[PDB]
Every structure is written in structure tokens, then in C-alpha cells.
Design a protein around this nucleic acid. Structure first.
Ligand SMILES: CN[C@@H]1[C@H](O)[C@H](NC)[C@H]2O[C@@]3(O)C(=O)C[C@@H](C)O[C@H]3O[C@@H]2[C@H]1O
Ligand SMILES: [Mg+2]
Ligand SMILES: [Mg+2]
Ligand SMILES: [Mg+2]
Ligand SMILES: [Mg+2]
Ligand SMILES: [Mg+2]
Ligand SMILES: [Mg+2]
Ligand SMILES: [Mg+2]
Ligand SMILES: [Mg+2]
Ligand SMILES: [Mg+2]
Ligand SMILES: [Mg+2]
Ligand SMILES: [Mg+2]
Ligand SMILES: [Mg+2]
Ligand SMILES: [Mg+2]
Ligand SMILES: [Mg+2]
Ligand SMILES: [Mg+2]
Ligand SMILES: [Mg+2]
Ligand SMILES: [Mg+2]
Ligand SMILES: [Mg+2]
Ligand SMILES: [Mg+2]
Ligand SMILES: [Mg+2]
Ligand SMILES: [Mg+2]
Ligand SMILES: [Mg+2]
Ligand SMILES: [Mg+2]
Ligand SMILES: [Mg+2]
Ligand SMILES: [Mg+2]
Ligand SMILES: [Mg+2]
Ligand SMILES: [Mg+2]
Ligand SMILES: [Mg+2]
Ligand SMILES: [Mg+2]
Ligand SMILES: [Mg+2]
Ligand SMILES: [Mg+2]
Ligand SMILES: [Mg+2]
Ligand SMILES: [Zn+2]
Lengths: 150, 208, 237, 138
RNA sequence: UAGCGCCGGCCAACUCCGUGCCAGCAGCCGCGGUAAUACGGAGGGCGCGAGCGUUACCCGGAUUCACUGGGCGUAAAGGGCGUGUAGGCGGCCUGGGGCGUCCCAUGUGAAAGACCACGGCUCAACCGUGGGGGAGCGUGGGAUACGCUCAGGCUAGACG
RNA sequence: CCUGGUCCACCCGUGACGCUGAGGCGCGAAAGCGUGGGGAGCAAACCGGAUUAGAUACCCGGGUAGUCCACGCCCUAAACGAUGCGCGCUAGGUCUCUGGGUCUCCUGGGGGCCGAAGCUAACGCGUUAAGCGCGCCGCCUGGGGAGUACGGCCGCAAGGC
RNA sequence: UUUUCU
């Protein structure tokens, strides 16, 4: 069914009278490579607990990517926070050309050939959110037609 | 010059079983049958999740070590495949598969690709009559690839083309065990090949 | 079922501390009150009830919510008639959104009523024993109606969407339709099935809710009964 | 004064649709009406109509949106997702029939202004003409 | 004939010994003051191979001079305020011109190089033949929506 | 007394006469400078008392320039909303200053607060935008060296650009 | 009132 890729895990802290109290953050991508993708970010005292909570969260936040011959219906640019992500469709043989974060997401999304580009703040977390947001605004001629009918 | 050096160790590192030899990499020997783990002191300790790099790296290494071609040549070929019309992945495989040494290996004149290379090098192989000794020579569709009249008596070539009686040959090839001739029908497709390779990953490795 | 031209109760309400988004239902402001368009109140009732019979006959559950004092008692009466759950006291954060959890509170409840009644009701320190009496009273105070839900409802009926906004939120987030008797002081865009009319007033409320329960009862395999809640409307006056 | 009326109208439309108005007025001008006709034909708006306001000519632009949605923020999807002026004063933009951009792989459109009249990138590409690249809609 | 660099993260490749904030490493973060995958050696390993590595310089990553493609309340960044010259920009309707702009045809755009095909040297590098495209500019013809210009009209800007 | 700006009403007049604005020109808090005058109070410097390990300070007693006026210079500033100007567009609520109307409300100009959508790194902004747009000007391009050096222009000088 | 350094 779903496949899980571990995007990134950070250690994070918080000072306390007595010492630093660590916590863990994990970004998790869950997909079927069929046009079903999920992003989850969960924290917890131990890495595992985080990672697990992460996948769990991911499965609860799926996007239905309108794949189309290994690529995407059209180009979009989404700005999340100070982070900008740009997706451009590509012909076969190109591969998934993108940085780790958008990639892992795009791969499990079932995407197989895309042209990508991170702009602005390259915060993995915010870049991931933007990639997702982008995949979401993806439309098909069908959808567009449906929207402008009547 | 080409690699040289223990081969059934690359198999181990690459995980998959590469057939860098003949008869043996079939016997219950080719290390992958004994110790299917990478060479060296830490070959058996737990393996850490590979980085995207490692992944793409290994994949290329694998595909490349199969045809035992250098990185230089391997790369140039890739760039050519990349420049032509049509899916780079397939095309690239097609070009590698068009190397004379490979075709000689494909026709059974040689037990392994290395052996094939040496056959070509020592002029034991011929392309449409004229003899060619460039392992890198590119066989095109239509070319007849035979064994040297003079060489047709070499024990090895006898032994080999003998075992070929029976064995089938790639759908892009045709062998005439009779006169020790072979013919390059067409460029093999990705579907024709069954390499333990993820060409998508190799294409990506060069993206970076 | 139904009854129109009910100026006899609802219509106009709320000073003028309105919500511009509710203009599509305000007929005209007269000496204060914005006054609701009763025509539309019907048009909405039509569609909304249609949706209720839908669930009703289909065997679907509806969670009635009315923390407000104006409809606190009523929410019970009517929710009692239809075998429907309700929230009267205070909406706990996450009843829907954190159901699996806030449900254990109900397990604990039953578990306690079981302890009392007779088995071991008097076997341990009268101190600990009276401590339990509290949990019960409390659990019974907040879970008296939310006790029925065995799974997330197929819909929610809200008395004052603004007053009961957190509820409306969890519903939304979970994709549970939202039915609501709501007026001037609110955002209609958040109500899936609206009923524009007086959010307060025991009289106003009672009417809408009752008929919705008459309609839930009917269209389900039963026969309509006059609401005993109307006794509360009289008493209120 | 309005430095750029076309940009003005595109923005009124942009602003009105972001709050979901039904109608929306923009001061009347032939050219404006021309652009609007494409918007309608392309199904971006319900249509428009010449109307008089305070004795002056405007253009009711009947906007249109997608259907109500689920979960939080059930706000309709937009029909006009994007609408931006390209050619602008102090910075004009002209393209040859072979430089006409393809908006969102055709899912979107562009509105040129040629000597053959206001056309969409396709209409223009067809008549084989180029011109001032007025705006991009999608 | 087989060599050279590397194995803390970036970055593919880990262990033992020696050393003890020393000797040294270092592109950046940083490493070494007795358990150092970071210093030196060894074993093992990764990368490439008659090469490998360093230093230097150009472009890239750098949307970090932002035309494509950035900014200025508190991060660098609004001029102390105004009056106003040059300049930049310019509401609605009609008509003439056709400068900008758009279109077609034509001339030019050497060869080499670049792209494609076939071919010569056993391959390739290298080279032969052929084909294709090509900004800009000249000339001829055409279009007039927008920008321009000229002429006329308007009152929603402006002023009285 | 002389004099600038500005808002509302009527819709009367002109008929795009508009916006911005490098340079220029003018204005520009305090301190400061030149000439003359004035000088109660205050008060750099300074002269003393005290406090302190010391006290070139904070506290107390005095006190000159100055603070004031006229004329002429200087031109700086947390000269701040730390937010260039103009125009159009985008929920409301509430307080307030000023005008009109059919005046327990409506309509305009201005000053505040809470907030729709939206924006923002966040804080926050939100019809008095930091939202959505068009026009023009100014300015930024890691920190230190340094607002320094040099050159030029300005100034009586201090010093400014 | 004042009342340093670590
Ligand atoms: C004197 N009692 C204190 C007091 O209870 C402190 N919390 C208010 C408590 O704080 C702790 O619990 C902590 O969190 C950290 C530790 C340094 O002191 C711990 O022990 C601290 C206790 O010793
Ligand atoms: Mg941004
Ligand atoms: Mg290719
Ligand atoms: Mg442009
Ligand atoms: Mg590694
Ligand atoms: Mg030493
Ligand atoms: Mg040691
Ligand atoms: Mg190292
Ligand atoms: Mg070492
Ligand atoms: Mg070589
Ligand atoms: Mg650049
Ligand atoms: Mg720019
Ligand atoms: Mg910047
Ligand atoms: Mg600053
Ligand atoms: Mg200012
Ligand atoms: Mg001017
Ligand atoms: Mg004009
Ligand atoms: Mg012309
Ligand atoms: Mg030409
Ligand atoms: Mg040849
Ligand atoms: Mg006056
Ligand atoms: Mg008049
Ligand atoms: Mg006139
Ligand atoms: Mg002074
Ligand atoms: Mg003086
Ligand atoms: Mg004194
Ligand atoms: Mg004193
Ligand atoms: Mg001054
Ligand atoms: Mg006001
Ligand atoms: Mg908001
Ligand atoms: Mg606010
Ligand atoms: Mg420097
Ligand atoms: Mg001088
Ligand atoms: Zn093997």
C-alpha cells in the first residue's frame, strides 16, 4: 500500500532550570506512487515516537495529485512563508529533478518526470508544506472546463 | 585501462548479482551465494539508511560495472543518449548494449563480458567481414558479427559456441551456431533487457 | 409537518451587532432589531428538513447542541424524544475531534454506576466512596446526553453557531454536516444547513427544534407526539 | 486619475472575486468592453452589461465561482484563479505571433491586442498575428 | 606498467595503534588537553585511473544588482518638508496619418564553429558531403486593436 | 490689523488644464556663530559644600556663555508613523473633532480604537493598509575599517554635503 | 543617600 520516506528529523530544545530538555521533530512522506501523497510532521520525546506520530499524521493529510503520464498537468509556483517552490511539467526520460524535500514528496506522489526549483527561504519544513500546497492547486483541463461550463 | 581486480566483490558491494564471469557466477560459488554482503572488515555490521546520493551512486555503479566500462566512456555515452530524441533511459541502455564487446558476449562467443573484450582485442571477432578489435566499437542494426576464420579453431571458441547449441538469443539478435555467425537485428529496448537497474536513478545521478 | 408564516414567534432578533455575512437573510432593521426574512426562513427550512428526513429514516444519528441558557432545557426535551444525543452543560474541547478519548469518560461513567447500585458500593473507605459519588455526579452532569454517541454523529444540530462555535469547528474539520438555528449575530457560511431565525428566546427555539424532532420521529417508523417541552415555554413566560 | 484603466478593471475583478461579490462595476470604455467579451466567452465571468451609475457609464461584471466546499472554509474555488496585467505604461510589452506565451499549458489564456483586434493567444495564433500582450488569465 | 585522492558532516567510504589544545588538520562548521571514524600510521573501504590531487582564474549554484527575477514600519534601505524645471506617466467618444507595434514577400546574415543525417580513417577523436535553423538590418506590400500624432467632441480628473 | 491652507452646500463656470518630479529655489527643532540690545528665572564651563576607596559624577550652595529680541549666518536630529507622493479597488463595529440634510438616523472632511478578506519572519497592519493594483521620485546590496581618508562644493567658525 | 569587581 503506502510507502514511507523520512524527509528530515531535527533535535530541537528548550532551556530549563536544570538543563536542556530535548524533543524530536520528524517530517514524513507517505504515498502509493499512484497519485496519493501525504505529509506529516510530528514531534515527541523520542525519535521513534516522533517518526511514528509523523507517519500517522501524514496518512491523515492526503492530497490527490492529478498525475498525467508521469508528470503534472501544468506549471505552478507556490509561496509558503518565506519559501517558494516551483514545479514545471516535463517529458519522459527527464527524471524527478528536485531537491530532497520536494523530491521525496513528488516520488511517492507517483511523479516520475518533473522540473523543480526552490526559491526564497529554503526551510525544509516550509518547502514541504509549499510543495503539498502546490500539488493541491494542480488542475486538469477537465476541472477547468468544469469550472467554466454553464 | 578497464578495472581489473577481484570482481565477485563488486557483486557483493552492489548487493545484486552481476555476472562478471561465466560458468562460475552460476556454480554454487559466486560469493553472493556464500557471503552476499559487501567486502572488507565491516561487511557484516548493520547498514545505515543510504542517503539519496548513495542510492543514485550505487545504481550508476551497478549499471556501469555490468558492462565493465570506465566512468569516462560510460559518462560520454550517457551524454549522447541524453542528447538524442527519445527516452534517455532506454536510449542509454541501447547504446551500451551496442558495444561490440557486449554483442559478442550476447552471442555466446564469449563466456563473460571481460572474455568478450579480450576476444575482440585479439582480433578473433569480425564485423561484416573486416575484423574489428575495438571493444567500444558500436554495432549497428544489420551488422553480421562472426568469429575469425583463422580463430574458428580456437579450443575456447569451440567450447563456447558448442555450449551455444540449444541456448536461445536476445530477440534483437540472431545466432547461427552453424557458421559461428551472429546478426544484430535491432537496438534492444528496456523491455528486452532485464538488468537489475533503475535507469531513472542513473539519469538523476547525473542531474545533480 | 411544518407550519409557515410563523411571525407568531421567530423573525427579527439581535440588536445591530450583526455579521454582515447574514445580510442575505435580514429583511429590514426596525427600531433596532434587524428582523429576519421569514420567506427565506421557510425556503431554508424546506431544504434543511429535507436533509433531516434524509438522516432520520436512513437511521442516522444527530447530536443536538445547546449550551446557551435560553435553550438549555429544550435541547434535552427534544433530544430525549428522538433517541438523539445532546450537549447541555458545556461543550468539552474535542468531543468530536477527540471522541475516542472523551468517550472513555463515558466508559468510566457506566463503570461507576456499575460500582454503585450495589456491588461493592459499600466495601471501601467512605471517603474514597464519596469521592466516586463526585466523578459520577460530574460525569453525569456533562455526559448525560453525549452518553448515546457510540461513534461520530452523521450530523450536528446547533442552536447558536456563534455561541457553540467550537462545536461547529470540530464538525467542519471532521466533515460532519452542520445544521443550525442561527440569526443576525453569526456567519451563515459555516452552516451547511441553516435555519435563519431567533437564536435566543425559549419560544422561538422550542418551535423549530420540536418540529425537527416531530419530523425525526415521524419518518423513522414511529408516530408523532406533542412536545412536553412547550410546558417550558409557558413556564418561561 | 487612473494611470492604467485596464489594470484597474482587472484588479476590481480580482478584488471583488476574492470576497465573492456577485456583480461589480468598472468605468465603461470600448477597449474594456472588448477585453470583457473574451472573459465571458472564455467562461471566466457570467457575462457583463452596460449600466448607468450616477449618470455615468459602467460595466456590471457578473462574476462566477465554483461550488461550495467541504471541511473548514467551504469557500468556493475561484473560476478566475489568476488575472494579471502584463503590458503596462512606462513598460509596454509586444510579442510576435511566434512569441505569444502559452498560459498554464493552455489551461489558462492570454489576451493580446492585435491590429486584427483583441484576441486570446489561440485566436491570435490562429489568425497568425501578434500585438500588445495585455494580460494573462487562468 | 598502476597509480593518486579521499573515508566527522556537506560527501561514497571505519576500525586498531600511536599522540595527549602537543605534534598537527582545516573549503566551511570545527577537530587535538588519555575511549579521537576529524592529527600520524596501519588494516579495511569509497572514488577515479596513465592518471590523480593542488594552486590560480571564468560561469554556476547566487532570485546575492532580481529584464526574466529582489527589496526599504522594527533586519541594509524613504530624501527633514515643500515649491517646481527637465523628464517619465496620462480620463471618455469620433476621424485622419500609420512613427512605435503586428503580418507577408525579398536581400543580407562568408567560411569555420553550433544542430541533424549520411559517409572516410578497424572505432572514436579528427575529417568529407548534404540538410536545417538563425537574431539584427535593407527594400516592397498589408493591418490599425493598443502606444504615438494631428484634428474634433465630452465631463466622471483637475481647476474656478 | 495683515496673511496662507482647508472642509461643506449649490450644482453655476473652464474643459484633461492631470500625477510625479533628477537638478534649482525656498523652509527647516535644539545647540552653535557674527553685530547690536537685553538679562528676572534657569544654567554647559567654572568656583565651592558633600558623598566615595577615588567622584574630574549623581545630591547641595553659587555661577559665565547661553536661554530672550532684532538683523545676518549655520542645516543638523530617534528632523519618527523609524511607514515618499497621487489615484482606484476591498466587511463591519465603536469613540471623537468639524460641516450638511427630510437630525434618535443619513451624508462629507479629520483624529483614535477593535476587527472581514488579505498581507506579514514574527510583532503586527487592516477604507487613516503594512491588503489588491497603476504612475513617478528617493534609497538598500554582510559586519568592522568609516560617515573615516582623499577630492570637490558650502560655511566666519564649528562644521555640513 | 551612595555602595565596585568575580
Ligand atoms: C525547592 N524545591 C524545588 C522546586 O520544587 C522546583 N520547582 C518549583 C523543582 O524544580 C525541579 O523539579 C526541576 O524542574 C529542575 C531541577 C533543577 O530542580 C527540580 O527540583 C526543584 C525543587 O528542589
Ligand atoms: Mg515573501
Ligand atoms: Mg534523450
Ligand atoms: Mg515582460
Ligand atoms: Mg557517508
Ligand atoms: Mg609532540
Ligand atoms: Mg586513542
Ligand atoms: Mg577528514
Ligand atoms: Mg586518521
Ligand atoms: Mg584514456
Ligand atoms: Mg545572477
Ligand atoms: Mg525586478
Ligand atoms: Mg533582499
Ligand atoms: Mg534600519
Ligand atoms: Mg518622512
Ligand atoms: Mg512635467
Ligand atoms: Mg490615452
Ligand atoms: Mg508603421
Ligand atoms: Mg530576413
Ligand atoms: Mg563510419
Ligand atoms: Mg482663509
Ligand atoms: Mg454644470
Ligand atoms: Mg461645453
Ligand atoms: Mg536657538
Ligand atoms: Mg549670539
Ligand atoms: Mg542656580
Ligand atoms: Mg547646581
Ligand atoms: Mg535652524
Ligand atoms: Mg473617518
Ligand atoms: Mg484573518
Ligand atoms: Mg488592528
Ligand atoms: Mg569586507
Ligand atoms: Mg572658508
Ligand atoms: Zn559474481
Amino acid at each position: 500500500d503506502f510507502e514511507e520516506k523520512m524527509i528530515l528529523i531535527r533535535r530541537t530544545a528548550r532551556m530549563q532550570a536544570g538543563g536542556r530538555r530535548f524533543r524530536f521533530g520528524a517530517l514524513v512522506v507517505v504515498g502509493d506512487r499512484q497519485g496519493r501523497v501525504g505529509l506529516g510532521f510530528g514531534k515527541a520525546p523520542e525519535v521513534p515516537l516522533a517518526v511514528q506520530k509523523a507517519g500517522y499524521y501524514a496518512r491523515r493529510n492526503m492530497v490527490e495529485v492529478p498525475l498525467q503520464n508521469g508528470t503534472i498537468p501544468h506549471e505552478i509556483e507556490v509561496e509558503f512563508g518565506a519559501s517558494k517552490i516551483v514545479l514545471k511539467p516535463a517529458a519522459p526520460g527527464t527524471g524527478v529533478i528536485a531537491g530532497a524535500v520536494p523530491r521525496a514528496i513528488l516520488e511517492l506522489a507517483g511523479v516520475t518526470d518533473i522540473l523543480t526549483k526552490e526559491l526564497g527561504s529554503r526551510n525544509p519544513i516550509n518547502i514541504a508544506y509549499a510543495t503539498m500546497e502546490a500539488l493541491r492547486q494542480l488542475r486538469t483541463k477537465a476541472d477547468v472546463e468544469r469550472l467554466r461550463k454553464g | 585501462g578497464r578495472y581489473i581486480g577481484p570482481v565477485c566483490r563488486l557483486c557483493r558491494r552492489e548487493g545484486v548479482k552481476l555476472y562478471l564471469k561465466g560458468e562460475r557466477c552460476y556454480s554454487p560459488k559466486c560469493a553472493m551465494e556464500r557471503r552476499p554482503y559487501p567486502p572488507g572488515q565491516h561487511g557484516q555490521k548493520r547498514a545505515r539508511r543510504p542517503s539519496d546520493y548513495a542510492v543514485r551512486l550505487r545504481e550508476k555503479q551497478k549499471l556501469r560495472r555490468i558492462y565493465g566500462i570506465s566512468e569516462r566512456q560510460f559518462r560520454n555515452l550517457f551524454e549522447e543518449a541524453s542528447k538524442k530524441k527519445g527516452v534517455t533511459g532506454s536510449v542509454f541502455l541501447g547504446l551500451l548494449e551496442s558495444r561490440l564487446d557486449n554483442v559478442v558476449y550476447r552471442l555466446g562467443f564469449a563466456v563473460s563480458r571481460r572474455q568478450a573484450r579480450q576476444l575482440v582485442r585479439h582480433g578473433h571477432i569480425t564485423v561484416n567481414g573486416r575484423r574489428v578489435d575495438l571493444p567500444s566499437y558500436r554495432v549497428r542494426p544489420g551488422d553480421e558479427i562472426a568469429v575469425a576464420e583463422k580463430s574458428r579453431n580456437l579450443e575456447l571458441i569451440r567450447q563456447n559456441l558448442e555450449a551455444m547449441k540449444g541456448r536461445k538469443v536476445g530477440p534483437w539478435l540472431s545466432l547461427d551456431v552453424e557458421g559461428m555467425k551472429g546478426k544484430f537485428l535491432r537496438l534492444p529496448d528496456r523491455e528486452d533487457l532485464a538488468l537489475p537497474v533503475q535507469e531513472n536513478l542513473v539519469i538523476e545521478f547525473y542531474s545533480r | 409537518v411544518k407550519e409557515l408564516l410563523e411571525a407568531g414567534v421567530h423573525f427579527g432578533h439581535e440588536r445591530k451587532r450583526w455579521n454582515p455575512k447574514f445580510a442575505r437573510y435580514i429583511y429590514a432593521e426596525r427600531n433596532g432589531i434587524h428582523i429576519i426574512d421569514l420567506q427565506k426562513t421557510m425556503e431554508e427550512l424546506e431544504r434543511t428538513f429535507r436533509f433531516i428526513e434524509d438522516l432520520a429514516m436512513r437511521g442516522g444519528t444527530i447530536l443536538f447542541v445547546g449550551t446557551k441558557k435560553q435553550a438549555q432545557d429544550i435541547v434535552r426535551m427534544e433530544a430525549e424524544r428522538a433517541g438523539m444525543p445532546y450537549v447541555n452543560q458545556r461543550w468539552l474541547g474535542g468531543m468530536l475531534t477527540n471522541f475516542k478519548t472523551i468517550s472513555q469518560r463515558v466508559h468510566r461513567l457506566e463503570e461507576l454506576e456499575a460500582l454503585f447500585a450495589s456491588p461493592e458500593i459499600e466495601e471501601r473507605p467512605k471517603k474514597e466512596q464519596v469521592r466516586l459519588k463526585h466523578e459520577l455526579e460530574r460525569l453525569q452532569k456533562y455526559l448525560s446526553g453525549f452518553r448515546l454517541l457510540k461513534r461520530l454523529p452523521d450530523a450536528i444540530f446547533v442552536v447558536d453557531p456563534t455561541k457553540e462555535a467550537i462545536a461547529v469547528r470540530e464538525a467542519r474539520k471532521l466533515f460532519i454536516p452542520v445544521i443550525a438555528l442561527a440569526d443576525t449575530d453569526s456567519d451563515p457560511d459555516l452552516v451547511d444547513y441553516i435555519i435563519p431565525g431567533n437564536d435566543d428566546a425559549i419560544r422561538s427555539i422550542q418551535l423549530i427544534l420540536s418540529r425537527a424532532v416531530d419530523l425525526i420521529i415521524q419518518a423513522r417508523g414511529g408516530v408523532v407526539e406533542p412536545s412536553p417541552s412547550y410546558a417550558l415555554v409557558q413556564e418561561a413566560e | 486619475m487612473l494611470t492604467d484603466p485596464i489594470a484597474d478593471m482587472l484588479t476590481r475583478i480580482r478584488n471583488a472575486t476574492r470576497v465573492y461579490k456577485e456583480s461589480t462595476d468598472v468605468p465603461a470604455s470600448r477597449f474594456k468592453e472588448e477585453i470583457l467579451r473574451i472573459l465571458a466567452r472564455e467562461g471566466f465571468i457570467k457575462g457583463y452589461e452596460r449600466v448607468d451609475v450616477d449618470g455615468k457609464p459602467y460595466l456590471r461584471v457578473y462574476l462566477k465561482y465554483g461550488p461550495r466546499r467541504q471541511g473548514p472554509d467551504p469557500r468556493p474555488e475561484q473560476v478566475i484563479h489568476h488575472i494579471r496585467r502584463i503590458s503596462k505604461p512606462g513598460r509596454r510589452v509586444y510579442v510576435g505571433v511566434k512569441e505569444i506565451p502559452r498560459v498554464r499549458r493552455g489551461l489558462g489564456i492570454a489576451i493580446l491586442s492585435t491590429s486584427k483586434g483583441v484576441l486570446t493567444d489561440r485566436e491570435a495564433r490562429k489568425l497568425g498575428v501578434g500585438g500588445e500582450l495585455i494580460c494573462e488569465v487562468w
